[PDB]
Design a protein around this ligand. Structure first.
Ligand SMILES: [Mg+2]
Lengths: 121, 773, 65, 136, 63
């Protein structure tokens, strides 16, 4: 995927990168900058389940990170969010292509596991 | 080792005053010489423009006058009105041209020509020129005395590399592995308190090193003892194409070199190119320079001495103007030279006199004239005044146990350059638990409440970019903090004569100033004076020079030599020379760089003097100033207050040289006079109202006026003037390119009868055109 | 993307091949088709990033030309 | 937008409706540095420690009170209006934008006593601006 | 201080025909930091656009 000549001849040197939202200090306070949610669905019930987090985490905004459902055949169906991104103050504008403090979006990614139970136990 | 040049690093400052001795300033050659001089004129006065014009009109142009009159004017009788008095080097020929075909023989000769001069130079920022001296050695005994038949010819080659160099994001040495110096604790790099950032190329659309040579401005010239003609140092940018006056040199008949800096003109290649970044603005050039100073000694008898090596040659660097020459940075560039040769873990071997710690408290105290936090929010300066009120400053000089409590009370308010105090160690990073300086990129989540007081001084530092890092805030460097620590514990000496002039801080300050004035080592004093006015932290990038100067690796020689007087150290005197590429402009490393970015890895690799990176410390012309912001006005306008959520104290960057809060002339005219003055106007009041009031209330109004401090950014029109003007940070950077020459200049002025007002007998007053009344 | 509609010579050659029902030539590994395959391949950027560059000062810097 | 309109001349600074939207105020921070007399019974007197406050001459103590009393703060700086932080832009427009949320954090000016002004020249009743940014 | 503005050029041939050229299209502000951000009204700016009066005098052989 990547020739060794890029690093070896320094064709595009990697830059240092500062923290996003740098005014929030200490690791324990920075944990609120992380949105997270979990949920479980089984083949016994089709009812959809929202993966709803909060920003800032444990005024706070609900973030629907996704929704999951599982039919009677055991196939999980994962829906992403509604595409809602937002700042904590309406005057916080997202003028940088990638790094905008005070913003959160509903993009997410995480771990999918399962448990199979058969008749015999 | 027969001849050497002094100072080793000369410093000249830009200004739009003319490059002539009567209307210029001179870089300090004696530390503290004129701190209380109330006759200083740092701006061209109307007085000196008349005095210049009448010296020009000395006989027998005043018999020429009469020949022309008995002979409006015509092309060639004007042709020799000018030239007579020699104003060609002052004003364009064709501004004096119509000065008088727009028209006591002489008085509307003088009147029109002086309003010409006034139009160009009245209130102009005078250039601070640097004088260079040849000292015969063996150890500089006395300055070279030129017999008849002898001559010295100087040679200066300078360059500007700002537009060719890399962005300034922060100091690269902040992550450089080190054992620790007297200037920078090893905790900064070892604990990653303010990590160095990568930096891309300025003007990055210019590709290939051969085309990037067009971005460097360079010039060179020579002057000799046999002619005092002034020769300009002028390069081109790029090398339309604009002419860049980087300096002007001249030698007098005694062989002294005088170096004038540029006129302070910065410009873009297109008018639409605005300098909206504090440091890195492509398409821009300025007339800042720096380079190599060498000379030849040619005596009557054929003996020729070439001063060319790094041990005997010198350097020159031009800088932004010193807007308060009499206010000293709490930590100077000379302090950086002194601390550069020390190892951090060997600081317990340092021995301390009181004159080693007195400059800290003295400079911090005098910062009240250029910064509000130091006038009304500095509990150390308020205690100094308390001791000053009862003539009990001498207690500070007591090393006994009865004064330890008092010395420790002042020392504990200062910031430890170990940066290991007032922190909570995360997940064992060091997170400060005192007041932080937030990013402008906001996050609406409540700040963690500080639990430790803000230590002194209240200035930002190299790690400003990192909220919660203890290096956001400035600390006096390790070796100066060690002095303060030894003074705290009592491990310091002081002579009885010093306690006998220590009733107030001012009396002791005048005493030490006389120690400087009467010390014999003329060369090393001039060496320290060139650098004692410059800043020495924080470096983001700073005002004049920056972080390479605080590393011993940049000097070829840096040794302690002597105290100021045999009994009084006063931080001492050193003989230091910068490392130099003896080829100069023709060096093969003149146009060296590190590719698309520079990083600390490049700095790490440059410590080894045999690596392909060691050229970083063997300076060529342009290498000193290339790190600073381009144009310099953008950094100056960025060198002010950095506001916190909490209103006080107000952080200030480099207020000693770029003041933040000043006492304007307008206020001075409303407190300078006593109530018994019998002018029609007394302190802005009519005579009747002035003397009709209580004298208690009269002097109360004097102190009110004296207390009104103006934002120095408001001393000219930096984009905030007018109905619905935007003002703001960026408009300040843009307007400073033209308005730097109208910014307020602080000058010592006298209050002849303060009475009981509380106004000191010498005040420092900021002069501008907006601030006048 | 407009460039691949009207400024991509490879896409224009593909359309040339399509218009004569001759795209199968690209599947020919024999010598009679080598100049056809090579002309297309020679227009692609080499991820070695060592083509179309002037080596600045051999500390080497590779500058695209 | 209801504040100062700066002219090329520095003083006087023109002000729109300063009696209801003040422009230059005496913040609580300065009030706490002049309200006490030198004989006060507090471990901290006018920002100073007891010992430093009562160690100075009476003239110099009173001079510091008037010096503090005279420090007027831009009313726009009594809250974060876009000028706070490293490299913050500030300016007129950010003021307008931020005032929508920051109007409720601006300084509120209130009459407060100076119980023993002495010879300081500080009137017995002063008007002091209270806000979260300007309290110490 | 003060800029020269070429508002046009005039020349007359030996046949009596006048030829009027316009300026070079130089537009400038009095200081570089003043930007023409408005479509019509930008203070501190000048341009070499002109308009004016064209008159003539015919002098014949016969006086
Ligand atoms: Mg200064």
């Amino acid at each position: 995927n990547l020739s060794k000549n890029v690093s070896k001849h320094r064709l595009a040197p990697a830059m240092t990168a500062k923290r996003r939202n740098p005014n929030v200090i200490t690791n324990s306070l920075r944990k609120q900058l992380v949105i997270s949610s979990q949920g479980s669905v089984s083949s016994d019930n089709n009812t959809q389940v929202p993966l709803r987090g909060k920003f800032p985490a444990n005024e706070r905004h609900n973030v629907l990170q996704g929704s999951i459902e599982c039919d009677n055949e055991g196939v999980l169906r994962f829906y992403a969010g509604n595409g809602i991104s937002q700042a904590l103050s309406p005057s916080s504008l997202n003028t940088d292509f990638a790094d905008n403090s005070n913003w959160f979006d509903d993009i997410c990614d995480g771990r999918v596991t399962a448990v199979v139970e058969l008749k015999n136990g | 080792c027969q001849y050497k040049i002094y100072p080793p690093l000369g410093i000249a400052r830009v200004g739009n005053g003319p490059a002539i001795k009567p209307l210029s300033l001179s870089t300090p050659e004696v530390p503290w010489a004129h701190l209380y001089d109330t006759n200083v004129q740092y701006l061209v006065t109307q007085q000196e423009l008349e005095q210049l014009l009448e010296e020009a009109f000395g006989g027998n142009v005043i018999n020429e006058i009469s020949q022309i009159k008995t002979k409006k004017f015509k092309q060639e009788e004007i042709e020799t009105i000018t030239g007579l008095l020699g104003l060609s080097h002052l004003v364009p020929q064709q501004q004096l041209s119509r000065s008088l075909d727009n028209l006591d023989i002489v008085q509307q000769i003088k009147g029109a020509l002086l309003k010409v001069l006034s139009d160009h130079y009245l209130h102009a920022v005078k250039k601070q020129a640097q004088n260079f001296y040849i000292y015969k050695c063996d150890n500089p005994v006395e300055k070279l005395k030129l017999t008849d038949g002898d001559k010295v010819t100087w040679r200066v080659e300078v360059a500007n590399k700002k537009s060719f160099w890399y962005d300034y994001n922060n100091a690269l040495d902040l992550s450089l592995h080190t054992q620790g110096s007297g200037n920078l604790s090893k905790n900064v790099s070892k604990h990653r308190l303010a990590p160095a950032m990568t930096a891309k190329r300025r003007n990055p659309n210019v590709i290939t090193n051969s085309l990037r040579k067009q971005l460097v401005i360079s010039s060179q010239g020579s002057v000799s003892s046999d002619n005092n003609t002034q020769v300009p140092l002028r390069g081109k940018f790029p090398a339309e194409r604009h002419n860049v006056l980087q300096g002007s040199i001249e030698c007098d008949n005694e062989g002294v070199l005088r170096f004038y800096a540029g006129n302070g003109i910065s410009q873009a290649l297109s008018p639409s190119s605005l300098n909206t970044d504090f440091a890195d603005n492509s398409n821009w050039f300025d007339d800042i320079c720096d380079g190599r100073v060498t000379a030849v000694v040619e005596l009557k008898n054929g003996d020729t001495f070439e001063i060319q090596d790094e041990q005997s040659s010198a350097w020159v660097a031009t800088t932004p103007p010193d807007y308060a020459p009499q206010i000293e940075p709490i930590v100077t560039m000379y302090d950086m030279v002194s601390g550069a040769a020390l190892k951090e873990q060997d600081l317990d071997n340092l021995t301390t006199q009181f004159s080693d710690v007195f400059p800290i408290l003295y400079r911090l105290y005098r910062m009240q004239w250029v910064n509000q936090a130091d006038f009304t929010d500095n509990a150390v300066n308020t205690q100094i005044r308390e001791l000053n009120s009862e003539l009990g400053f001498a207690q500070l000089l007591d090393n006994s146990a009865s004064a330890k409590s008092l010395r420790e009370g002042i020392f504990n308010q200062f910031r430890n350059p170990l940066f290991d105090q007032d922190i909570d160690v995360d997940d064992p990073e060091w997170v400060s638990n005192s007041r932080i300086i937030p990013s402008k990129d906001e996050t609406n989540i409540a700040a963690k409440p500080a639990t430790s007081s803000l230590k002194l001084p209240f200035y930002p530092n190299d790690g400003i970019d990192y909220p919660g890092s203890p290096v956001q805030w400035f600390a006096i460097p390790p070796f100066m903090y060690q002095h303060l620590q030894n003074w705290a514990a009592g491990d310091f000496s002081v002579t009885q004569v010093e306690k006998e002039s220590a009733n107030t801080i001012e009396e002791l300050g005048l005493f030490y100033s006389e120690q400087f004035k009467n010390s014999p080592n003329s060369a090393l004093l001039c060496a320290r004076g060139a650098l004692d006015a410059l800043y020495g932290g924080g470096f983001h990038p700073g005002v004049e020079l920056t972080w390479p100067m605080r590393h011993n690796l940049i000097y070829s020689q840096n040794d302690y030599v002597s105290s100021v007087t045999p009994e009084i150290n006063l931080l001492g005197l050193r003989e230091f020379r910068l490392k130099q590429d003896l080829q100069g402009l023709n060096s093969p490393n003149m146009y060296q760089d590190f590719g698309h970015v520079i990083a600390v890895d490049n700095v790490t690799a440059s410590i080894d003097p045999n690596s392909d990176a060691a050229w970083l410390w063997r300076s060529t012309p342009g290498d000193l100033t290339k790190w600073m912001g381009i144009p310099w006005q953008s950094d100056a306008a960025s060198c002010q207050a950095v506001y916190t959520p909490e209103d006080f104290p107000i952080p200030s960057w480099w207020a000693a040289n770029l003041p933040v809060h000043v006492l304007p002339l307008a206020r001075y005219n409303k407190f300078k006079d006593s109530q018994s003055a019998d002018l029609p106007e007394i302190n802005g009041m009519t005579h009747s109202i002035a003397q009709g009031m209580s004298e208690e209330t009269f002097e109360h109004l004097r102190l009110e006026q004296f207390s009104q401090r103006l934002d120095w950014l408001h001393t000219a029109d930096l984009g905030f003037v007018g109905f619905h003007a935007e003002g703001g940070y960026t408009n300040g950077l843009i307007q400073m390119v033209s308005q730097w020459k109208n910014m307020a200049m602080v000058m010592a002025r006298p209050v002849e009868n303060p009475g009981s007002s509380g106004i000191p007998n010498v005040v420092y007053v900021a002069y501008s055109q907006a601030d006048k009344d | 993307n407009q460039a691949d509609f009207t400024d991509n010579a490879v896409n224009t050659q593909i359309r040339e091949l399509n218009s004569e029902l001759g795209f199968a030539q690209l599947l020919d590994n024999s010598a009679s088709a080598k100049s056809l395959r090579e002309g297309i391949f020679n227009q692609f950027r080499n991820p070695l990033f060592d083509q179309d560059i002037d080596v600045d000062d051999p500390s080497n810097e590779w500058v695209s030309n």
